[PDB]
Amino acid sequence: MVGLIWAQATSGVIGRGGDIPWRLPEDQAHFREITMGHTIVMGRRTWDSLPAKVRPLPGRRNVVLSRQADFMASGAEVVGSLEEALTSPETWVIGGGQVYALALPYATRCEVTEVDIGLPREAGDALAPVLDETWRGETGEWRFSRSGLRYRLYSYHRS
Amino acid sequence: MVGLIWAQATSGVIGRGGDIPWRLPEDQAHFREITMGHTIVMGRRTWDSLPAKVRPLPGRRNVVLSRQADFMASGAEVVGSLEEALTSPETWVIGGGQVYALALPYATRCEVTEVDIGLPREAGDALAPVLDETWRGETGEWRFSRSGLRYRLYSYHRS
Ligand SMILES: NC(=O)C1=CN([C@@H]2O[C@H](COP(=O)(O)OP(=O)(O)OC[C@H]3O[C@@H](n4cnc5c(N)ncnc54)[C@H](OP(=O)(O)O)[C@@H]3O)[C@@H](O)[C@H]2O)C=CC1
Ligand SMILES: NC(=O)C1=CN([C@@H]2O[C@H](COP(=O)(O)OP(=O)(O)OC[C@H]3O[C@@H](n4cnc5c(N)ncnc54)[C@H](OP(=O)(O)O)[C@@H]3O)[C@@H](O)[C@H]2O)C=CC1
Numbered sequence: 397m398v399g400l401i402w403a404q405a406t407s408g409v410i411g412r413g414g415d416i417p418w419r420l421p422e423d424q425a426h427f428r429e430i431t432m433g434h435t436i437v438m439g440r441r442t443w444d445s446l447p448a449k450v451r452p453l454p455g456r457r458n459v460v461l462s463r464q465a466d467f468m469a470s471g472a473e474v475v476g477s478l479e480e481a482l483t484s485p486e487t488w489v490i491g492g493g494q495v496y497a498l499a500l501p502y503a504t505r506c507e508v509t510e511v512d513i514g515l516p517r518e519a520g521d522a523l524a525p526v527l528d529e530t531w532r533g534e535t536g537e538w539r540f541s542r543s544g545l546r547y548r549l550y551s552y553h554r555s
Numbered sequence: 556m557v558g559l560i561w562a563q564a565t566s567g568v569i570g571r572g573g574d575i576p577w578r579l580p581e582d583q584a585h586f587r588e589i590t591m592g593h594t595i596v597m598g599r600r601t602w603d604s605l606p607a608k609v610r611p612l613p614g615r616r617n618v619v620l621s622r623q624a625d626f627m628a629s630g631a632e633v634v635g636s637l638e639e640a641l642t643s644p645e646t647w648v649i650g651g652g653q654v655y656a657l658a659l660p661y662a663t664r665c666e667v668t669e670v671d672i673g674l675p676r677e678a679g680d681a682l683a684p685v686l687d688e689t690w691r692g693e694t695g696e697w698r699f700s701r702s703g704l705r706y707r708l709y710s711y712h713r714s
């Protein structure tokens with residue numbers, strides 16, 4: 397099972413300037429719960445952006461996707477194609493924008509957090525992938541966060 | 556991944572008299588979506604509850620749990636233990652009450668439909684399993700079924 401998991405502003409923005417333009421602790425706990433124990437696949441840019449302190453993510457098989465054949469991600473497996481990353485019963489693709497779009501055709505689930513920030517799309521932003529008709533989704537109720545922000549969870553599935 | 560999927564009254568009743576005391580087309584559609592393509596495991600009593608006619612459920616590996624070594628389930632596999640049924644990336648336990656209880660220690664997902672029907676628990680009823688503190692649950696909004704009963708979907712997960 398290949399799933400994607402991401403957190404986006406309502407506008408689709410997931411990233412800017414190499415970082416995240418918000419903080420939502422509840423989303424981090426949700427992300428941890430969904431990925432824990434499983435393989436996680438990230439793009440090289442996302443790996444670089446993480447402080448070495450939080451890297452690799454505990455309890456998960458960390459895989460970094462890079463076009464650099466001898467790239468070394470200390471504490472992670474480096475692979476040159478998504479297919480090499482996709483063993484194990486359950487793999488979660490955890491960003492960023494380029495790798496979500498690459499992985500979506502392989503995916504059967506998307507777990508999406510929507511953050512109610514009015515954040516406009518800007519040139520250069522990382523964006524969430526666009527989900528076609530084949531994605532049936534269940535809207536969660538609007539939760540409320542200790543950061544003061546309103547957010548909502550979507551569980552998308554297909555086939 | 557082993558998931559449980561069930562529909563319950565608010566009281567926890569999931570079955571009565573070998574059948575179900577309601578019928579929501581919206582829940583049947585959600586059940587089909589979540590299970591399609593995967594292994595589905597059901598107790599022998601639940602297989603008996605299916606008319607020959609809709610058995611086995613199409614597009615899914617139908618597995619029936621029975622202690623009867625001679626029991627025939629035309630269109631399905633009949634296994635004597637639950638562990639024999641776990642050779643697929645996604646396995647959905649689809650009932651009934653005894654198999655839910657037996658499968659729960661293997662489960663990381665519960666997809667629950669709560670039906671807003673006041674249904675006192677009678678002797679002989681089959682009940683939903685009790686979810687302890689290890690389970691983290693998404694709730695959705697209460698929705699109107701065309702049968703006139705409200706319902707809502709819970710997605711529970713634990714690592
Ligand atoms: N949920 C969220 O909100 C999340 C947001 N983010 C954000 O996303 C942003 C980064 O995303 P983005 O810039 O798109 O980068 P990615 O993280 O998607 O990394 C892109 C890199 O992937 C590598 N790669 C290897 N093989 C391929 C391939 N076949 N196709 C494409 N890429 C390949 C390349 O690395 P190389 O150059 O080495 O070859 C490429 O530079 C940051 O702002 C980050 O904070 C990240 C995670 C989650
Ligand atoms: N979502 C919902 O609301 C659902 C409701 N239901 C309802 O649930 C009810 C049936 O549930 P229930 O009565 O609990 O019966 P089950 O469907 O759970 O079947 C129980 C049978 O499974 C077999 N079995 C049980 N435990 C084991 C084991 N450890 N090893 C091997 N075989 C085992 C036995 O079969 P054998 O006797 O052959 O040995 C036992 O008789 C019906 O009302 C049905 O309509 C059913 C599914 C979904």
Ligand SMILES: COc1ccccc1-c1nc(N)nc(N)c1C#CC1CC1
Nearest residue numbers: 401402403416423424427442490491509
């Ligand atoms: C902005 O989101 C977060 C902010 C802090 C911590 C985790 C998340 C997060 N959340 C969801 N829902 N999906 C995700 N892929 C991620 C991620 C990631 C890569 C850095 C490893």
Ligand SMILES: COc1ccccc1-c1nc(N)nc(N)c1C#CC1CC1
Nearest residue numbers: 560561562575582583586601649650668
């Ligand atoms: C009252 O439930 C239903 C009624 C008709 C069709 C499907 C369902 C259903 N729904 C949820 N949500 N979970 C489930 N396990 C099931 C089931 C089943 C076994 C008979 C095959």
Ligand SMILES: [Co+2]
Nearest residue numbers: 504555589591
């Ligand atoms: Co599926």
Ligand SMILES: [Co+2]
Nearest residue numbers: 430663713714
């Ligand atoms: Co898991």
